[model samples]
Target chain A: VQEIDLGLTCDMHVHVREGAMCELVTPKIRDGGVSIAYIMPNLQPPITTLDRVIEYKKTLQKLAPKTTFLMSFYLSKDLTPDLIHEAAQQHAIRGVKCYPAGVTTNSAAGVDPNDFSAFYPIFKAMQEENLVLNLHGEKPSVHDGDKEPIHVLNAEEAFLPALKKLHNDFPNLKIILEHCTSESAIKTIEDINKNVKKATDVKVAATLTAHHLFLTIDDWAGNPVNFCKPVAKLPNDKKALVKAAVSGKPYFFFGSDSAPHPVQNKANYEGVCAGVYSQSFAIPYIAQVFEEQNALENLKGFVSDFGISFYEVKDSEVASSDKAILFKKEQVIPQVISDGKDISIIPFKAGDKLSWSVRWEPRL
Target chain B: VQEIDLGLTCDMHVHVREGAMCELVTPKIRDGGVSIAYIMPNLQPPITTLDRVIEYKKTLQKLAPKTTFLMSFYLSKDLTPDLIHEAAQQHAIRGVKCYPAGVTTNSAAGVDPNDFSAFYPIFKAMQEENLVLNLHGEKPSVHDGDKEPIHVLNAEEAFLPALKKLHNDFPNLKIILEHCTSESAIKTIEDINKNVKKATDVKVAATLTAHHLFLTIDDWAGNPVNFCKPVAKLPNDKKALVKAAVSGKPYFFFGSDSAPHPVQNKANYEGVCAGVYSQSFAIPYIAQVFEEQNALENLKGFVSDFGISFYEVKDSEVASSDKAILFKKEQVIPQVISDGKDISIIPFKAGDKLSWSVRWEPRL
Candidate 1:
């Protein structure tokens, strides 16, 4: 109803690709006041080692001197306990990402959760090391006689059993279900929260994306820009996501999942690789959702407090301060970024007007 | 399963644009052995007038000399009994095509079937003249509280009430529900066929497209070439369609509905124009479906007989035959048509191998 201040936000999930183009995406994230972001490791050839993690951080720091880049490594069959321990000791790894093989962009090296036995040693190491396990939870290997678009729609929900298995197997592990898009996902997160004993060290929470919170599968019809892996789902699924975000619960927090693809990659004849570029308008868009829901007061907890506490990075050396990020009632979002004729990118809510604006300087 | 012979076929619905480009589409239809096709009227500046119908026929005749083009006029607010009477008398109109305004390709001028009161006189005249009414059955204007992807998925089902009303109002009128993609459309068609008395003189039936029978919504994920309005639906819908086609009930028949958009129109970044360019492999594709269903014997009635009888053109003066369309096992479909660099089209099942191959000579 009125202007609110959501202070010093952190986008817990995002893709800022390496090298020259990383510079293109960083400005948007920096301008949006996201001082700290958990960078996704699903790059061209995914970052599967601690060496890759260190190098990626150095590259991001050069492009975005002000922003602090929290890092993660792509899950692989070759991941050893020593690697996890080394990365954690260096304070270079926030979590280890597990993408179902072939589930999303640059995820060919991802592990199939159905074949979880092979990854037990890796899970044990992550759990013992207190490293967060971030999951792109969608089943890639289909059911016995399943048929598609339904199969495609049901892929994410099918991963629920695997999620539950992981939680049970590693009771002391911290898991963040990234970009919760379906009712099954919300229910899975709720079930985990409900059944876990207060004394138990097992912790499970879900990250809500601005795209999933704002758009449904209907939005993808005439607009390929809205397409993403674990596609924004049915209206009911969207309602569940919104309810989770504004429910005043610590289990739900902000993760922009602000993945960008060039205009050519998105609007092509071959096929669109699924991802939505939401970094530019991420904070303002979530602010609009909260303002509309009359829960503007909860913005600080979702954008800042909960994620920092969940990942146990609150006490890490990133220098904490309560800096206010101001918002205006109405704001215009840039529709697309054009580097040149062949390299333009359209972000979510492109050319659209938002009801909230963020006013702040990047801590970076 | 052994290969079989399907007699000469007719594609009940298709779009072959006029002029030089007409030449591009015609060879595929003629070479596929479609002796007659119900040409769509949704051209640029749609063929709404009796004068336009005659002129378009001349252009098609020049390009496809071997195939007969049965014409239909686009329904309009200004459509009159006089125009229907004139086209019917001249044997120029096969049926009047009705598209829910903005439903599919070039249908900006399509009529609203819900506002049937405005077109009662047109229906009354069509009944008297024994001309068929072909409908692209979908409700473009959704229910007040409906939501997307689901709403878009349920668009065809929403038109059931309009369909039932038309059948009830015109007991002596014949209707063809074109491209019945969902189980709802099949059930609606079945309901119409059941309630109508054997002696009532009214008749209603539905056309099944090859894409509807073979591809589900899953096919559209990596392949936008399979995308279309009344989008290829759930796998269950595809199963239901194949069942209806092979059920040996004269109420259901084949209509390729093979609408082509140059690769640019289909595989672009902006919303894809809805329609599959399946005309090239229409017969081979359906033959593959029938073989899979173990209903190869029903292919003749579905592909050749039912549509001709339903339209009452079986006895018309076009030269007729019961020539067998033969087939072999295992054939590779050309992935992309390269008539020239600018004239390439990606056909259905492109680059994929069909288990069956046509054994007869092309009429062209």
Candidate 2:
């Protein structure tokens, strides 16, 4: 009960942006008790080419030498059937991140969710090579439609049908509803995986964040620090997220989505970047929620086992042979993490105490 | 059609805080094209005493001599039947503002919604004296209990039953659900007033803010400036609010609730204050929404007639006989309003354009 061997924890949906911000937060993946990080492709000019993906992975690896970085392609017209095959052949990417345009930070070039048929050929190539399809499953925030309007509160739920249709069209494709934030989405994922008796057969899965388990709309209404895309919903949604996070369900696992914004960007009156900087204390934050639910025994399943299994990670895929050892240690989340300079970050649940900490150790 | 006479306008739920913020925002009532402003009593130490209410009114009168300031007592044990009797007799206050404890800024001393029996004596006195009961209609945000959880999203809807019970308990009491933000709350208010045949016989009402008509949860999610208590609900809720505001219903009126917070407070990463500073452009902001709905003719009823009728504002109650004439004159909302120094504030929908403008003209 005091110390848990969480093993090789994977955060399957992460955004450590380019240049200075990336350098500041990339290593915190390991610091946050996550050994394997699935890096998003949403750079200013998104990572589409194999060269960009490889270079991006190199930069992330150099920043966190021991951390295993799983890079991905930014899903767009820049992507083609040949590119997917080439990227899969080089192991440059394990997945493709699909963002709906204007939904989040640096997503201007993202594809339209209304008609995703254009990407069917690319999806076919990905499915053939077993490359995962990661979706930021939210329609653009809007209110002018005959069908149910899609605002931040119901954007995820509104997009659930598209996710289902995508799954129906590509049943064998490894698809992840990245950073799922609604009860409806949870139900959809559950319904999709209901008959899958084997862990390896989870074609459709979801990534829950450390913050969503603890936040409802109230938490982010005033505080920009807790704001993110698919803004946290009602208390029932949080309850559903908490339930899914600790249910020992293979299709539901961690994806810190630990997006960082500069203090100026976050501490603004308008256009505050949509993300929570949860990278520094991801596991402990999630562990506390699981502990509160009395599902501490299932912690490893959510944080380590499920994502690694779903991604089919191998010994050669990771940079280090070290596993995360979660232990009993009380520490206050620093008010601000910085290099004692201007480039600073405010962590999720900053100034709060965590009852657990994580360390890495060699498995052999 | 381009030039519409809006008559004497009223904003029945407003907060001009003490000292610097008070001096800065009080006069904005008239600038926003409101001739009558109902001032909230939630100061650092809420205005509960007769002397304090009178003094606050005097200061606001000095700040905007031509604008009528309708004052209220912050509901708490600090008030009594004797105080209400004296204040109503002296015309020091027209209503008693009830806030559920810790619902918003300076609402820490507000009463518990579960038990209003204790304040029944004060309510009785106010009813007898023809003073209204203004409610900040939101239950405290909490997720514990067998009953459904109350979050910011559903907090207003959850409190609708309490409003109904209060109205039932005091059938003749003039009650206004202050700054209602939910479709459920709007429906409840309409249901309560359905039996009333005349505007003068109305017993219960609800205030709609200009911001709520245009904002859903999406607007305030990332933008702290647009964020306020009982945070904007889903898009359907906004559509309902827009419909109610434009319905020309006597029970549905404007209460700008133009709460002003300092820039530093709103632009912070944590503990940002809940309020929208719509005071500076209140009429234009609202007229734009009205025009968009093609209900510009109903603008006067929402902004002027209903609030004045419900509160029973007499000719002697107002400071000036100036009527606001709304006209088609496009103007961009200022990026920030200030005394050109440390006293800056951001308005709701800052940097947005309003197609219609208001100009006050003296009436014989």
Candidate 3:
């Protein structure tokens, strides 16, 4: 088939930020052939209220009228059981995104991963509401001796046990290890879903990013463009990630984690912003990897079916029922994605060519 | 003592590039309070001839008249046994610096680490001349499955066995593992020197950089200013490096690897230059680490006496009979080191406070 039909494609983990940058990238959802984008709430002051999330969705909906916008709450002291329940009732948010404090961009107000018990009430409400709990899955870097150093290389792996503990603490609560970057993260998600009988019953899942699929520690060592939180791991880890992504397992699916920073923000000496802008060409990137891995047949399960099932995104939640079709059309990623004037972002694998292209067609 | 008198400090591994960059950083030898600076030869067209190295020395001498410059030949196919003999006979070059191809900046013309046999003739000549063999120890990154991966994190460690083999191949040869970043690299250097009887007889030594002493994989993960070749490994590796630096072992001494690049070079999205520009304040950086590690007493040996002794730098060979005195003087690292008009280079630990300062005092 020239066009691999990935019906109603979704990017479960994405950060299309606020203001001009947000305006520029929000319309990229359909451009990337993702009919649905689960928006991250890590803004300048993060989204805690339903008013903010709904309005944010409205703004994004206006930017790309045919694309679905699934919102989330940035987990912090500001959230409550009442808020979670209210948000779920209103269908305002699919999950509460947890960021371990100071881990990545706009994550300063995030909670301590060491102690998630303080948010037990919120978890209980989330479990009851069947709303997902999205975790960044990284312990903040600490260099103190005598204790195992939680650094960039093992930050995600180090948080694996915490992920397991969270599942153990609230088994009924649906959870996702967002932007899963390591082998251990893939293994943990697979281990959790080992006994699952049906795809719909997958309470826990992992989202694999397009960039991590192609990168390793060396890729980002000198290149600030590929630099992101829970940075790409070793080659063995990347191989494991590729296997998991193309494994056709219901628990493992796609999330671009396409956190776009300004070209200047990425071009820096110190405090180079942590992100990879892959959103504008999201599906094509994943399609190229899947095709190379000889799992081209499994691309739809990863890019469309599995994510939609995990998030339970519905017709009412979506703006359009466009079928994302990936075709064999080679295209080169631009050096910098710009709005022709003000905003510019250097994308992952910029100036590189991929053998696939994504397009959206009207669905029944 | 508020003022610690460090005698004849040396940085065995340094890269003061050619033309404008060379003119800018060559004088930093005295600025960083070093009496002798060992220069690298990994230029665009590497230094292989006697005339270029001699003229390079004359240029550096003119730039910093009070400082001494020890030059080296870039180890490549261009170098022959005859050239090594003449360079040694005329004291035109003190050593031969080997860089594995594609490992770091200006190292594209480097030899293959896998096949050192091609350079055996040159190594044999260097050994016969009692000239040092400086190695930028790292295997280029390879992602072939079923083979153990050689990446930025393990590149230095992976090159360790080869380093040992080179020493074993030529027992009399003087070899220094340049910018030792890993615990395994530290262990290898220590293991090789275990049977040594005296400091003067030491042929295998490692140069620990000021940046690596304070940094780990975490430091340079996001900050391009802290990034460099054989990128800093994990926390335990960093702890081991710090311990090695302060262990007062003659085998472990200072080499800032104080590579400089334009401020714009350090701030980039892609192909960011690999180096830490710490040349201007090298001694104080090392002093700060030694002070913090509570091994301030051993600072002189790591900074001065040991490297000078290892290289066997004689009184007549040096331009100035001066003492590098490190004193308690709190000062912050500047945002960028510049000549004030143009040619700005962002340095390591920029905008960070240091408790020590370095000054050169005339000797007896």
Of the pair 1 and 2, which is ahead by DockQ? 2
Residue pairs clashing in model 3 are none
Order candidates by lDDT, high to low: 3, 2, 1
**Could you tell me which 10 consecutive residues in candidate 2 chain B have the lowest summed lDDT?**
B193-202
Clashing residue pairs for model 1? A66-A364, A149-B218, A335-A351, B326-B359
CAPRI verdict (incorrect, acceptable, medium, high) for model 1: medium
Q: For residue A22, what is the lDDT in candidate 3?
A: 81
lDDT of 1 by residue, B233-259 (tens): 777777679889998778888888888
Model 1, span A250-364: residue lDDT tens: 7788899888788778776556788888887778878788878888788888887777777766535563343437557676766678655455788788878887666664344
Summarize candidate 3's per-residue lDDT along B48-118 as a digit string, tens digits: 88999999888888988888889999988888899899889898899989989998988999999899888
Local distance difference test values of all predictions, in order: 0.77, 0.86, 0.87
Q: Score candidate 1 by TM-score against the native.
A: 0.93
DockQ of every candidate structure: 0.49, 0.82, 0.90
- DockQ for model 1 equals 0.49
lDDT of 3 at B315: 89
Top candidate when judged by DockQ against the true structure: 3
Residue A15 deviation, candidate 2, in Å? 2.2
**Candidate rank order under TM-score:** 3, 2, 1
Off by over 4 Å in 1: A1-3, A141-150, A195-202, A319-324, A340-342, A361-364, B1-4, B141-150, B195-202, B319-324, B359-364
RMSD of 3: 1.6
Worst 10 residues of 1 chain B by lDDT: B141-150
Worst 10 residues of 1 chain A by lDDT: A141-150
